[PDB]
Scaffold this active site. Structure first.
Site, PDB file in Angstrom:
ATOM      1  N   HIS A 107      -8.464   5.128   8.620  1.00  7.18           N
ATOM      2  CA  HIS A 107      -7.761   5.802   9.698  1.00  7.18           C
ATOM      3  C   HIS A 107      -7.691   7.317   9.541  1.00  7.18           C
ATOM      4  O   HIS A 107      -7.284   8.025  10.462  1.00  7.18           O
ATOM      5  CB  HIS A 107      -6.361   5.208   9.905  1.00  7.18           C
ATOM      6  CG  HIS A 107      -5.532   5.278   8.668  1.00  7.18           C
ATOM      7  ND1 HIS A 107      -5.789   4.463   7.578  1.00  7.18           N
ATOM      8  CD2 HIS A 107      -4.468   6.067   8.366  1.00  7.18           C
ATOM      9  CE1 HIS A 107      -4.893   4.769   6.649  1.00  7.18           C
ATOM     10  NE2 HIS A 107      -4.082   5.723   7.094  1.00  7.18           N
ATOM     11  N   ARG A 123       0.830  -1.175   0.000  1.00  8.03           N
ATOM     12  CA  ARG A 123       0.000   0.000   0.000  1.00  8.03           C
ATOM     13  C   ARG A 123       0.873   1.235   0.000  1.00  8.03           C
ATOM     14  O   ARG A 123       1.402   1.642   1.035  1.00  8.03           O
ATOM     15  CB  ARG A 123      -1.043   0.067   1.103  1.00  8.03           C
ATOM     16  CG  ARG A 123      -2.241   0.891   0.647  1.00  8.03           C
ATOM     17  CD  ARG A 123      -2.707   1.937   1.649  1.00  8.03           C
ATOM     18  NE  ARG A 123      -1.666   2.888   2.027  1.00  8.03           N
ATOM     19  CZ  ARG A 123      -1.904   4.077   2.585  1.00  8.03           C
ATOM     20  NH1 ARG A 123      -3.135   4.508   2.833  1.00  8.03           N
ATOM     21  NH2 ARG A 123      -0.876   4.864   2.894  1.00  8.03           N
ATOM     22  N   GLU A 163      -2.364   5.497  -2.468  1.00  5.40           N
ATOM     23  CA  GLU A 163      -3.331   6.357  -1.821  1.00  5.40           C
ATOM     24  C   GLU A 163      -3.372   7.756  -2.418  1.00  5.40           C
ATOM     25  O   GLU A 163      -2.521   8.594  -2.132  1.00  5.40           O
ATOM     26  CB  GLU A 163      -3.122   6.448  -0.309  1.00  5.40           C
ATOM     27  CG  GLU A 163      -4.273   7.196   0.381  1.00  5.40           C
ATOM     28  CD  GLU A 163      -3.784   8.323   1.239  1.00  5.40           C
ATOM     29  OE1 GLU A 163      -2.608   8.602   1.358  1.00  5.40           O
ATOM     30  OE2 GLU A 163      -4.755   9.026   1.758  1.00  5.40           O
ATOM     31  N   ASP A 166       1.948   4.910   0.067  1.00  6.05           N
ATOM     32  CA  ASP A 166       1.485   6.098   0.735  1.00  6.05           C
ATOM     33  C   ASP A 166       1.659   7.367  -0.089  1.00  6.05           C
ATOM     34  O   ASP A 166       2.644   7.532  -0.806  1.00  6.05           O
ATOM     35  CB  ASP A 166       2.179   6.250   2.094  1.00  6.05           C
ATOM     36  CG  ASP A 166       1.530   7.282   2.948  1.00  6.05           C
ATOM     37  OD1 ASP A 166       0.545   7.053   3.615  1.00  6.05           O
ATOM     38  OD2 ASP A 166       2.147   8.437   2.923  1.00  6.05           O
TER      39      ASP A 166
END
Ligand SMILES: OC[C@H]1O[C@H](O[C@H]2[C@H](O)[C@@H](O)[C@@H](O[C@H]3[C@H](O)[C@@H](O)[C@@H](O)O[C@@H]3CO)O[C@@H]2CO)[C@H](O)[C@@H](O)[C@@H]1O
Ligand SMILES: [Ca+2]
Ligand SMILES: [Ca+2]
Length: 683
Positions: free
Chosen positions: A328, A228, A258, A230
């Site tokens: 989050h 994943r 992301e 960032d």
């Protein structure tokens, strides 16, 4: 092997990810807990270490919590070493690296999470249970630093397996970007500037580029099954594309970045990224819309459908889009009141296109608005929650019903509160009825479906007040009442399928590499895979999976098609990017490229990576602010290493194309380190 295989790290369409915030999950080992300011045994100081560790996750695996839920993959926080300083906080009186976003050493583990040994146990245990392990990776920065005060935090110091590389202050090496902070004014602004106070890494730096590539191999070697990325929105596309190649060349693994999108926000750069970067993206358009409809009530089912349709046209690989209702960074989906809304959002997500991700504690009705209130310790591990059962029932469908995994999406009935869509993948079908109205029932008439004639029952077993239906020979459905807050799921899994390609990965390859084709009805006897019209080398052939070696075709985008040994031709899977060779990040610079109002500068060239002289597919608009100032333009581009390219710059406005004069520029792309080319606009 099958597409559903835990060994199928390149496909996630049939999986369900469970997002875990390591520190806030389970403290499986107290001996590894932090001491002093860092730690908070009470769990009241939201910005401090709570003790969550890899061992705690291992426990939840071995005890049947996650597995019983139907979760096939877990996405943990960045495993790399974080700063040890306790930053000052007015509200919480202390700010730590509990989140793991403040890297210190990308080559080492977080002592509080565990050791490389504990990480292995995690990987192994997860695998033994058929769970894929995804890790967070943030190569955009290190930690919060202050050039002015090297006494602040750790000065964003970067280590390389123990040995210090450099800090933020006195950065003689040029490992970081000293352009101040971003304000999100522009695409270029948020790339070369600091994301908040985080020390921005200069990936253009040969040392950094090499360091980041080697750092990832460390983890890939650990057995990870996904990454994943960032803040992919804060790094140059060129570098990222080049970074992806290195990963996919070493050991391919499903990767998604992301790229933050706000409410009703659509970004062309975002679309292009997901379509060319070589990596997938978190479906923010999906996530944000779902909340509007089911949570905040700022849009209708009509808006939900339009999102489904527009999304399907923009993204070349929708089956790769990672969906979610919260995270989050967002306020927890459940915000008090009725829990029905969450369940409907979960069911919708689980039966919708892409790859679902569930934030830990969703199934526990956890509440919390804003960071860090949305990062509380794991409440309970109760398996009775209606939400826990919803996932339990729907999750498995992604493996049993190819229609849910790779099928298309089509609206069959829709009003302001009701949404009845249908997932179709050949003969396989899935019909879902949702009624957001928690107080109004609806009489459903005029409904049609692809479901064969017969009587269908609710897959949810009435969990969400759903019931059975009857389909006529003409695909017509007997009128029925859609009670308030009702959620029903009907399906039909065909017994026999024709050659049907559902997925292809990776989407960015090179001749000689191996791609995995997932679908249905390929046959048991080897057939034929064609990259356009050129056949590839079969590495493995199964009814649901086909491994093939990329042919030596002209580098570019290709359309995949299959052909059973019986001669049956499958459907085509388009836009597979075949590169020229190993990628390298080269910075293009052109001086004296002055333009009029609304006119930009673009880069075109000899190779596919450069658009192949196609002005419509030119690289740009180039940047002209941070690093270099107008009239000098620049841009970070991924090109084939060791190749001699012929390029030329052009000016584009909207209805005009001004080419550069003289002869084409020539340059030989480096073989190892990053590069830079500086030229002057030819008249
Ligand atoms: O037969 C002509 C007509 O058929 C098709 O219409 C279907 C709609 O596409 C479908 O949405 C559904 O319509 C429901 C609406 O969603 C809802 O707003 C409400 O009005 O109830 C409708 C059910 O009658 O069903 C119809 C078919 O019954 C086709 O798409 C049209 O172009 C065409 O005119
Ligand atoms: Ca611990
Ligand atoms: Ca950056």
């Amino acid at each position: 092997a099958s597409d559903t295989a835990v060994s199928n790290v390149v496909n996630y369409s049939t999986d369900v990810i469970y997002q875990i915030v390591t520190d806030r999950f389970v403290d499986g080992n107290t001996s590894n807990n932090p001491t002093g300011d860092l730690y908070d045994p009470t769990h009241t100081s939201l910005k401090k270490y709570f003790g969550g560790d890899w061992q705690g996750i291992i426990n939840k695996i071995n005890d049947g919590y996650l597995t019983g839920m139907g979760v096939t993959a877990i996405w943990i926080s960045q495993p790399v070493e974080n700063i040890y300083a306790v930053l000052p906080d007015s509200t919480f009186g202390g700010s730590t690296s509990y989140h793991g976003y403040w890297a210190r050493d990308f080559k080492r583990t977080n002592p509080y999470f565990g050791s490389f040994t504990d990480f292995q146990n995690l990987i192994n245990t997860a695998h033994a249970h058929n769970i894929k392990v995804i890790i967070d990776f943030a190569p955009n920065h290190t930690s919060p630093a202050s050039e002015t005060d090297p006494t602040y935090a750790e000065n964003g110091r970067l280590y390389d397996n123990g040995t210090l590389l450099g800090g933020y202050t006195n950065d003689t090496n040029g490992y970081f970007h000293h352009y101040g902070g971003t304000d999100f004014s522009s695409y270029e602004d948020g790339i070369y500037r600091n994301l908040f106070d985080l020390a921005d890494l200069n990936q253009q730096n040969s040392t950094i580029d090499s360091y980041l590539k080697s750092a990832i191999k460390v983890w890939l070697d650990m057995g990870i099954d996904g990454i994943r990325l960032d803040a992919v929105k804060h790094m140059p596309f060129g570098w990222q594309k080049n970074f992806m190649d290195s990963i996919l060349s070493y050991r391919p693994v499903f990767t998604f970045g992301e790229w933050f999108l706000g409410t009703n926000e659509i970004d062309v750069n975002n679309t292009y990224f997901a379509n060319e970067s070589g990596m997938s993206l978190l479906d923010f358009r999906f996530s944000q819309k779902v909340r509007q409809v089911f949570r905040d009530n700022t849009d209708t089912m009509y808006g939900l459908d339009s999102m489904i349709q527009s999304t399907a046209s923009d993204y070349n690989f929708i089956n790769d889009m990672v969906t979610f209702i919260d995270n989050h960074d967002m306020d927890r989906f459940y915000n008090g009141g009725s829990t029905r809304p969450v369940e409907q959002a979960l069911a919708f997500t689980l039966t919708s296109r892409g790859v679902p991700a569930i934030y830990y504690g969703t199934e526990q009705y956890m509440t919390g608005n804003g960071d860090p209130y949305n990062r509380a310790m794991m409440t309970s591990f109760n398996t009775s929650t209606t939400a826990y059962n919803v996932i339990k029932k729907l999750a498995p469908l992604r493996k049993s019903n190819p229609a849910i995994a790779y099928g298309t999406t089509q609206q069959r009935w829709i009003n302001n509160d009701v949404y009845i869509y249908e997932r179709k993948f050949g003969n396989n079908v899935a019909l879902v009825a949702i009624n957001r109205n928690l107080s109004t029932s609806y009489n459903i008439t005029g409904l049609y479906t692809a479901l064969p004639a017969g009587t269908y029952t609710d897959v949810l077993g009435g969990l969400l007040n759903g019931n059975s239906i009857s389909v006529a020979s003409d695909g017509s459905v007997t009128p029925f009442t859609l009670s308030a807050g009702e959620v029903a799921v009907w399906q039909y899994v065909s017994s026999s399928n024709s050659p049907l390609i559902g997925h292809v990965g990776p989407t960015m390859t090179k001749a000689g590499q191996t791609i995995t084709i997932d679908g249905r009805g390929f046959g048991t006897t080897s057939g034929q895979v064609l990259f356009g019209s050129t056949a590839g080398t079969i590495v493995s052939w199964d009814d649901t999976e086909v491994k093939v070696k990329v042919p030596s075709v002209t580098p570019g985008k290709y359309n995949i098609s299959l052909k059973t040994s019986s001669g049956a031709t499958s459907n085509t899977y388009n836009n597979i990017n075949i590169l020229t060779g190993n990628q390298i990040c080269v910075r293009f610079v052109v001086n004296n490229a002055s333009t009029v109002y609304g006119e930009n500068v673009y880069l075109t060239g000899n190779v596919a990576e450069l658009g192949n002289w196609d002005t419509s597919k030119a690289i740009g608009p180039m940047f002209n602010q941070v690093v270099y100032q107008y009239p000098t333009w620049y841009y970070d581009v991924s090109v084939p290493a060791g190749t001699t390219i012929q390029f030329k710059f052009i000016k584009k406005n909207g209805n005009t194309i001004t080419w550069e004069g003289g002869s084409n520029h020539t340059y030989t792309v480096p073989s190892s380190s990053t590069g830079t080319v500086i030229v002057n606009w030819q008249q």
